[PDB]
């Protein structure tokens, strides 16, 4: 400001009008340089490294996702192999899979009947993260990532659901006749295909 005023007091009047664009741009550039914030040798935290740490964390998380999915496929095949859909049973009558169920203690599937499909908890067992930072210390990106991961990857969808005859004196079916009789017919043929008249 001292230079411009001195030039103006000296009578040059050169910076009048558009010439003022030079002092104007200069003043702005000086302001940006002194407004950059803290950058040191110890205060190393900056976008170029935080992004890398963010990038490294996302990549590691996906390999854990792959491990879960690989385990989940194993459960789908196994449960279907033991409790198929009612419509597939008609062709299977000649197969050795019929009247396969046994009561001799080791067969845990005795007295269990397929009633439909739904949600179930996988065979995986998740360990809580050690040294968890407090809510104010949590980085926002990795927080929701780990948060959403636990909610969806903790259950497996579209699996065959079952009911056990060994657990209750009765099971009251409440709804319209068509639903009630429909399922019972499904229950009757499932029982009949998997268990013999001797049991």
């Amino acid at each position: 400001g001292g230079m411009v005023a001195m030039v103006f007091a000296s009578g040059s009047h050169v910076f009048g009008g558009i010439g003022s664009i030079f002092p104007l741009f200069m003043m702005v550039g000086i302001m940006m340089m002194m407004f950059r914030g803290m950058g040191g040798g110890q205060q190393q935290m900056s976008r170029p490294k935080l992004d890398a740490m963010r990038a490294q964390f996302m990549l590691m998380l996906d390999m854990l996702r792959e491990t879960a999915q690989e385990s989940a496929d194993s459960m789908d095949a196994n449960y279907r192999w033991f409790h198929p859909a009612p419509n597939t049973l008609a062709a299977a009558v000649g197969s050795p899979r019929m009247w396969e169920r046994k009561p001799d203690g080791k067969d845990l599937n005795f007295g269990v009947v397929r009633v439909g499909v739904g949600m179930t908890r996988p065979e995986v067992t998740w360990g809580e993260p050690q040294n968890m930072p407090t809510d104010i210390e949590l980085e926002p990106v990795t927080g929701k990532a780990l948060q959403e991961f636990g909610r969806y990857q903790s259950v497996v969808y579209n699996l065959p659901k079952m009911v056990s005859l060994l657990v209750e004196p009765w099971y009251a079916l409440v709804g319209e006749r068509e639903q009630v009789l429909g399922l019972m017919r499904a229950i009757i043929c499932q029982l009949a295909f998997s268990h013999g008249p001797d049991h």
């Binding site: 050169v14 558009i18 010439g19 664009i21 976008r47 935080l50 992004d51 963010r54 990038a55 996302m58 990549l59 980085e139 926002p140 990106v141």
Partner: protein, 74 residues
């Protein structure tokens, strides 16, 4: 619900959004997310450099306009 509307925000949140924005932008054109190298940044920076250079030459023209004008006839 949560997250909706014009609430407050912080500087760490501004970069967080840009990180997700680049990663998703990459997935649409390359169909993979490894991001060993992050080319979007460089290609963008190249444009910014281009724009800056044009303005620098332009001011150079303004500088000469005062040093040796056309009004000095006769």
């Amino acid at each position: 619900g949560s997250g909706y509307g014009l609430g407050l925000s912080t500087r760490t949140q501004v970069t967080g959004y840009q990180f997700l924005a680049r990663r998703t932008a990459m997935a649409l054109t390359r169909w993979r997310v490894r991001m060993e190298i992050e080319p979007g940044r460089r290609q963008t920076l190249a444009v910014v450099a281009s724009v800056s250079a044009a303005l620098v030459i332009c001011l150079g023209a303004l500088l000469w306009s005062f040093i040796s004008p056309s009004g000095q006839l006769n």
